[PDB]
């Protein structure tokens, strides 16, 4: 079944888009410092208001300013997120009846005594790409 593969690829693309936007939420300067340098390279690119830069806000709320090391860390961390994002996208482009229902469901009767909870599909992917995933609670921002 390719349909599960196409869903699991689109979900992993959705989490990475939900991952890096959490960073741009907690640090607007990640996108802001970037779009300053692209504007002198690709002059077509529209950058937001000057007030949104200096007050370090996106819609209403001003965040706390970060030092250069934590910003550039996340700029290379979102970089390997985007490489994961494009790698999955490439394979996803390269992959994308009643009796066959019951034939698999009888094969789903195999191994009934599997006494084990399984919540590790949507959770191990979300925790892999979220902030502060390496320490016990909060020591290092870097994701798993």
């Amino acid at each position: 079944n390719l349909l599960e593969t196409r869903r699991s690829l689109l979900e992993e693309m959705e989490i990475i888009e939900n991952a890096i936007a959490e960073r741009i939420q907690r640090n607007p300067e990640l996108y802001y410092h970037y779009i300053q340098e692209s504007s002198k390279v690709f002059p077509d690119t529209k950058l937001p208001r000057s007030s949104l830069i200096a007050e370090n806000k996106i819609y209403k709320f001003k965040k706390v300013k970060r030092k250069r090391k934590q910003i550039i860390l996340q700029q290379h961390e979102i970089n390997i997120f985007l490489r994961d994002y494009q790698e999955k996208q490439q394979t996803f482009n390269k992959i994308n009846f009643e009796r066959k229902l019951q034939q698999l469901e009888k094969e789903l009767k195999n191994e009934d005594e599997n006494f084990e909870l399984d919540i590790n599909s949507k959770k191990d992917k979300y925790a892999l790409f979220s902030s502060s995933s390496d320490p016990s609670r909060r020591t290092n921002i870097l994701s798993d």
Partner: peptide, 25 residues
């Protein structure tokens, strides 16, 4: 992470022996 701005019987109980801490296991 998220601190954003916008834009009376005192001597009696010692005599009677109250408030002396004691426990039953």
């Amino acid at each position: 992470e998220g601190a954003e701005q916008v834009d009376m019987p005192y001597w009696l109980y010692k005599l009677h022996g109250l408030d002396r801490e004691y426990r039953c296991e």
